[PDB]
Design a protein around this nucleic acid. Sequence first.
RNA 1: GUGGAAGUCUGUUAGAGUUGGUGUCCUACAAUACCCUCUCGUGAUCUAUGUGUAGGGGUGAAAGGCCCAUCGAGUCCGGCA
RNA 2: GUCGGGUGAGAACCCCGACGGCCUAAUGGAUAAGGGUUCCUCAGCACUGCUGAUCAGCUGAGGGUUAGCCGGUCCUAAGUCAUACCGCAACUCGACUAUGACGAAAUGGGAAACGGGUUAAUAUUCCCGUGCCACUAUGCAGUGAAAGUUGACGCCCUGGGGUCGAUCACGCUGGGCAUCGCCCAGUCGAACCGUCCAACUCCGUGGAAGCCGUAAUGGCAGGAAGCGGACGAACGGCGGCAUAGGGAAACGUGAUUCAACCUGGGGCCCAUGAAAAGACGAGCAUAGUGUCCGUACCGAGAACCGACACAGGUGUCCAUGGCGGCGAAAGCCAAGGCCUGUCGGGAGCAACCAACGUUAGGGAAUUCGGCAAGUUAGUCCCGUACCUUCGGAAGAAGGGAUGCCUGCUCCGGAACGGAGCAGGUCGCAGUGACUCGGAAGCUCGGACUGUCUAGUAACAACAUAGGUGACCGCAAAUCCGCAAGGACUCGUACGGUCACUGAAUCCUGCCCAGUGCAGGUAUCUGAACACCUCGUACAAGAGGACGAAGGACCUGUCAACGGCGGGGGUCUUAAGGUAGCGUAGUACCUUGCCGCAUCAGUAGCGGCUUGCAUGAAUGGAUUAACCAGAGCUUCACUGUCCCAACGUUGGGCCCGGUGAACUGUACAUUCCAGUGCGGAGUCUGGAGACACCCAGGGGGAAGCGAAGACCCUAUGGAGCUUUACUGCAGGCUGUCGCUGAGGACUCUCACUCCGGGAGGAGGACACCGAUAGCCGGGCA
RNA 3: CGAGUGGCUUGCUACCUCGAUGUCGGUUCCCUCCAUCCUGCCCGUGCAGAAGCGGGCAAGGGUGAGGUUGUUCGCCUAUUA
RNA 4: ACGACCGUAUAGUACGAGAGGAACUACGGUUGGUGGCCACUGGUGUACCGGUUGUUCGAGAGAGCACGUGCCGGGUAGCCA
Lengths: 56, 237, 73
Amino acid sequence: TGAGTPSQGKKNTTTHTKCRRCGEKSYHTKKKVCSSCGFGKSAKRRDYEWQSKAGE
Amino acid sequence: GRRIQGQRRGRGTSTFRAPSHRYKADLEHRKVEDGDVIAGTVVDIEHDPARSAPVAAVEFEDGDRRLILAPEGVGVGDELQVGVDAEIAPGNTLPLAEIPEGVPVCNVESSPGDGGKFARASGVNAQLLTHDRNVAVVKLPSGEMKRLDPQCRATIGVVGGGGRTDKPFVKAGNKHHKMKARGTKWPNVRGVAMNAVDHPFGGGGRQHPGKPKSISRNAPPGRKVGDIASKRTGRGG
Amino acid sequence: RTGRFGPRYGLKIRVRVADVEIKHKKKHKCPVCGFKKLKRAGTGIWMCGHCGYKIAGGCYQPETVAGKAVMKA
RNA sequence: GUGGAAGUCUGUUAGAGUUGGUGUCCUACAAUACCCUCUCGUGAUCUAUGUGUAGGGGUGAAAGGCCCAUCGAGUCCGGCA
RNA sequence: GUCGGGUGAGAACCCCGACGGCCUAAUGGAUAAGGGUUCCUCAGCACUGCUGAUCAGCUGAGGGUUAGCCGGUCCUAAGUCAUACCGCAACUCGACUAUGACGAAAUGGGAAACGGGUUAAUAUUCCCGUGCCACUAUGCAGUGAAAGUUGACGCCCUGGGGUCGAUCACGCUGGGCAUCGCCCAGUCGAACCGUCCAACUCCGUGGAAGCCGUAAUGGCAGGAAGCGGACGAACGGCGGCAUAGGGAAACGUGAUUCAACCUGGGGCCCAUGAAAAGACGAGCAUAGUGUCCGUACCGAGAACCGACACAGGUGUCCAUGGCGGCGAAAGCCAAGGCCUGUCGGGAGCAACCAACGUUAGGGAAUUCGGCAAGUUAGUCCCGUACCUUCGGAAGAAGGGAUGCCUGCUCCGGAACGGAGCAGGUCGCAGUGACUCGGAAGCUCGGACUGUCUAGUAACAACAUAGGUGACCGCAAAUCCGCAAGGACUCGUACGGUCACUGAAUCCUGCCCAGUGCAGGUAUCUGAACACCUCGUACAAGAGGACGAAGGACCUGUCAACGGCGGGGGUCUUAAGGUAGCGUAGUACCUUGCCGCAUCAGUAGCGGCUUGCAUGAAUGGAUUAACCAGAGCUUCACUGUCCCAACGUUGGGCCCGGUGAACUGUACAUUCCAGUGCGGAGUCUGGAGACACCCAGGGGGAAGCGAAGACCCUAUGGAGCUUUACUGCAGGCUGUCGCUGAGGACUCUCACUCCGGGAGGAGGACACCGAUAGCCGGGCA
RNA sequence: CGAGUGGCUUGCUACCUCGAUGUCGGUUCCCUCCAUCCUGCCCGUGCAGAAGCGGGCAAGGGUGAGGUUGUUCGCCUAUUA
RNA sequence: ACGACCGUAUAGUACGAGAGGAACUACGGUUGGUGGCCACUGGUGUACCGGUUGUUCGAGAGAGCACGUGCCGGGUAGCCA
Ligand SMILES: [Cl-]
Ligand SMILES: [Cl-]
Ligand SMILES: [Cl-]
Ligand SMILES: [K+]
Ligand SMILES: [Mg+2]
Ligand SMILES: [Mg+2]
Ligand SMILES: [Mg+2]
Ligand SMILES: [Mg+2]
Ligand SMILES: [Mg+2]
Ligand SMILES: [Mg+2]
Ligand SMILES: [Mg+2]
Ligand SMILES: [Mg+2]
Ligand SMILES: [Mg+2]
Ligand SMILES: [Mg+2]
Ligand SMILES: [Mg+2]
Ligand SMILES: [Mg+2]
Ligand SMILES: [Mg+2]
Ligand SMILES: [Mg+2]
Ligand SMILES: [Mg+2]
Ligand SMILES: [Mg+2]
Ligand SMILES: [Mg+2]
Ligand SMILES: [Mg+2]
Ligand SMILES: [Mg+2]
Ligand SMILES: [Mg+2]
Ligand SMILES: [Mg+2]
Ligand SMILES: [Mg+2]
Ligand SMILES: [Mg+2]
Ligand SMILES: [Mg+2]
Ligand SMILES: [Mg+2]
Ligand SMILES: [Mg+2]
Ligand SMILES: [Mg+2]
Ligand SMILES: [Mg+2]
Ligand SMILES: [Mg+2]
Ligand SMILES: [Mg+2]
Ligand SMILES: [Mg+2]
Ligand SMILES: [Mg+2]
Ligand SMILES: [Mg+2]
Ligand SMILES: [Mg+2]
Ligand SMILES: [Mg+2]
Ligand SMILES: [Mg+2]
Ligand SMILES: [Mg+2]
Ligand SMILES: [Mg+2]
Ligand SMILES: [Mg+2]
Ligand SMILES: [Mg+2]
Ligand SMILES: [Mg+2]
Ligand SMILES: [Mg+2]
Ligand SMILES: [Mg+2]
Ligand SMILES: [Mg+2]
Ligand SMILES: [Mg+2]
Ligand SMILES: [Mg+2]
Ligand SMILES: [Mg+2]
Ligand code: NA
Ligand code: NA
Ligand code: NA
Ligand code: NA
Ligand code: NA
Ligand code: NA
Ligand code: NA
Ligand code: NA
Ligand code: NA
Ligand code: NA
Ligand code: NA
Ligand code: NA
Ligand code: NA
Ligand code: NA
Ligand code: NA
Ligand code: NA
Ligand code: NA
Ligand code: NA
Ligand code: NA
Ligand code: NA
């Protein structure tokens, strides 16, 4: 079975959804964790220094 | 290279775990305050999914209902006893001290009260040889002479289901069904049939182990494969 | 017997399956009563269709060479 | 004669698979398609949904196969001009 | 699709009718996910729609989803999270143990709903009628009340009960046809309340010594049949519901086969087939309460995923519509749906191409190869070789039959079930289409079913049962973690870990020198601490004594890595190739030699065989069965070939509409020669050459496509290996701390483990922290 | 032993292309060369004839079908001017 | 746009001890190639006519579908070898 187009047909599973805390469609309803703000994993807000250039 | 299969095992992932939730009971000798008065009646005989051997359901006088590691010859209606003063008949459990030397025994405790550790598989048995006030010498199924506290409890008789190993599996499918009830990854791909990256015996233009198969006791995991600290190999001599 | 295996598996494998299962399926004499009405109910489990007595025995035989040594000793 | 076993047979039942045609297509209907042919089809079977295992780590009946068109070490951003 | 017609400024494709077709597990009906308003109405055509459009899933504006009894909700599953505890430098990190919570919308468990009617769009939700459940209140009854039952369960075979459907018979109602007398539709009516009860189990009677019974197994003096009785089923029968409802009308009665549903019997397991909430147990009247969330529509060749109105992908239920037949098969046809797998018009419609039919005579001559195509075919009777693991081989092979019509026989309760008989009779052909094996032999490989390179490899590769070796007594062996801790393990040697070989059969020789592992070890070597000597008012430092693991040394071990020659009638380096097999899928010489077979055979098979460079679990030989595996031979077959022809359908060609891409330094009508960085349309010499356009098959533009995969180069990269260099985990071992009392010893008090506790085992060891030596491609 | 011609083989060289001039063999279809295998016309003969052998001119036309092998080559069979 | 071969007469002759065995010329035919043609033979011929299986239109009659003829039998014109 082709890994491309033919394998795209079984994709009717809902995972990432609108997050209660940040509003982004990143709340993974299976994991109950937002990949954008960290809701469900961290009280503190998700954020990293690599999200911007080193000297900025 | 990559971690070898024996290393994937330890992580305890689904593939390597036993289907515990499907198991029936943790066969252990009952705890008796003392006196031995404790007796019960066999209510049924069931199949043990964790041992491919029968097991007995018992109702004890004080209302307790527990499955028991069943020796051969136990049937519905029989009355089993557990205690120092328990009669000396198959199916009963008592300390090695109260057991007459020369009698076959099973489900022997390693240390008094641990509920039984030795001789529990199909058709096996231990052999109480010597007594004493300090040491009870038992011969385990492997043939080893084990010195045990005479206070260690045991069950009279040989474990039920003897002869299971006498019949060949005949086909892959039968192994399959058994393997599905154990904490084991099956089937087994030979190391020499793998790539170098996956196993120390992997690689090569043809199949053969790279070095000799006898590996030192001190070899680290990932390398300890083949014949571990073999004192000898082959059949000759 | 082993006839269900057709021409598969080889001699030893199926000669032993037939041997084991023929003994396995033989009429067995019940320990409680004395009637030859004991049938295997499963792995190591035996029962008398006459009185219902359910016993622990060998895997393919109600009595094993070792279970017999017990009675004596 | 009865009985109805089997990783048993035939079988485009459903369903699974993918041998040949090196056919059609090859700015495609399609970033793996179409047709004919062909294999399995009560079992180590096929399948939905839920669920677990995460990157030198998984998973692998082992082909360096697979881990979202990405694999002899995924993807994203950063180190980095 | 066509002919008429409707609307409109405009009609091939928007709508009506007729005629003609397509779809039958779907192109029909109901839905899960997912989409998210795509649903309905009105108004529109700038956008989207493979052409057009008055149409629309498009544009704009409005409207639309109604629940005690359908789902959610509640329960618990694999498993997940939170808090506590502990770890970690630390945490948004981490395992265990407690507690708590979460975790199933088709498709787990589960209190209760049916029928009719209604809208443009909802509907077990609204309306009408009827029924039912739970909780609470009032009243009567009741003291019972928690034991138990249920929820609640695997795979295979099978009996009985039985509804719908389908079919048959006959009657009634309506319709169709019009030489007959046939053919089609209908003939209805729920939940619920009540009642009936087969099977199973049990009781009494009875008293079988051979009877009873089954599809089959089976049953019995431990009490068979028979007889009587208790308990006891359907989504089933029956009555009510119902001068409810529905129908234009009639508004039937019986039967067979019987999905659903109910209830039994048997067989299998080295496999044992959830749990919890809840219900029952545990009466009745009346009344009150029953909130919250979902509900439109699509569910796909246009509403989902695939950038698209994508020929791909995507779960469940309808598996009982008719004929057919073994059939959920083909073919044909209903119901229902559709003409939207959405561009048309024209040319006997050329060449050429895609699918395909038929080809005389020959019959594999084609070709690497029978690739492709063809042959055979269903059912019954007869008959069936070598070989074989006695199963099989086998549908071997081969031979015969096959329709229709008339009258019958047999099996069975019967079928609109099956098996036969006699006579008549038509065709070239009776499995008349459809469905539907070509067959046989030799050799190689792997035993077999199974697995695999999603996307050029399906194989001989992997797996497998079987054979074997290794480790370990459980405070284990093996493995994960930095730690706290963890998998194996609800396990315990008939175990489970680590490896090799790979069914069966006959077998599996010799070698322990090297390497590996393991055991032993007088002596030798062997680190640090402590100790002794020298040195230093101390210290650095030098040296000694003691000596663990390890090494030297010795031994065991090849189904451990591997080895099995040259020379002579021993030497390297331990042995010197045994049974077998052999020009091999291993044989360089090589098309070896002989034979078979063919006109001719580098092929194939058999024999020989000094084997460039076969050989025993790096398994050897051999082998029935199996195989989309490799090679060869024969019969049959045939457009593969001799050698091509004609035809069919879709294109191609012309016309309307729509309308890209690749590619482009410039110039460019070239050809023959030459030259040039040695492979020129363009330079040189000649030749030829009026321009433009259509169709064609692709000679050239070293045609287009891709900063060559080959090769080398770079003090480039990466994956992999090892007795490369250097280090790092991990294991072993000494020492110090925890750590205590009296080169060997006892004890108990820390500490560890077992025990519910009492207490038991062990014990200054072990664990842990620190350090030293050895091993250490496991990893960098 | 000596002198040459060709550019089919092999070797040598490293000029051309590594931002690619698609491989061997086969096939199909076209043109050509002559160092002529057959055919035409001739010369010599150890030329009686017949059948040959050798040589000259000559490229108009012909030079086929098969068995083994991927083979080119080559071996083999029956036809053939 | 024609190449080549076989056969007959020549002739059992010339030649030759014999065995054997020509030629010029004139004829008939074959093969390969070439161009054209379809009276003849043959192929096709989903024009057409018949037979017949399954199913549907109630039967009959007459028809649709079974891949672009359901299958089988025959086959005109044309095109062809
Ligand atoms: Cl096992
Ligand atoms: Cl719902
Ligand atoms: Cl029955
Ligand atoms: K190049
Ligand atoms: Mg991928
Ligand atoms: Mg346990
Ligand atoms: Mg079996
Ligand atoms: Mg498992
Ligand atoms: Mg294996
Ligand atoms: Mg490999
Ligand atoms: Mg390695
Ligand atoms: Mg091997
Ligand atoms: Mg090997
Ligand atoms: Mg099968
Ligand atoms: Mg099949
Ligand atoms: Mg899943
Ligand atoms: Mg590889
Ligand atoms: Mg609409
Ligand atoms: Mg409108
Ligand atoms: Mg919940
Ligand atoms: Mg449910
Ligand atoms: Mg609707
Ligand atoms: Mg709806
Ligand atoms: Mg469409
Ligand atoms: Mg022919
Ligand atoms: Mg040939
Ligand atoms: Mg040929
Ligand atoms: Mg073929
Ligand atoms: Mg009869
Ligand atoms: Mg036929
Ligand atoms: Mg061979
Ligand atoms: Mg195989
Ligand atoms: Mg592939
Ligand atoms: Mg295959
Ligand atoms: Mg393939
Ligand atoms: Mg293998
Ligand atoms: Mg094995
Ligand atoms: Mg075994
Ligand atoms: Mg084994
Ligand atoms: Mg040979
Ligand atoms: Mg050996
Ligand atoms: Mg010029
Ligand atoms: Mg380059
Ligand atoms: Mg390379
Ligand atoms: Mg490198
Ligand atoms: Mg503990
Ligand atoms: Mg390395
Ligand atoms: Mg080119
Ligand atoms: Mg010349
Ligand atoms: Mg010429
Ligand atoms: Mg037709
Ligand atoms: Na290897
Ligand atoms: Na029999
Ligand atoms: Na295919
Ligand atoms: Na990585
Ligand atoms: Na970067
Ligand atoms: Na249209
Ligand atoms: Na009823
Ligand atoms: Na039918
Ligand atoms: Na199979
Ligand atoms: Na050795
Ligand atoms: Na050795
Ligand atoms: Na060897
Ligand atoms: Na297979
Ligand atoms: Na043809
Ligand atoms: Na060209
Ligand atoms: Na690499
Ligand atoms: Na270039
Ligand atoms: Na070529
Ligand atoms: Na010539
Ligand atoms: Na040849």
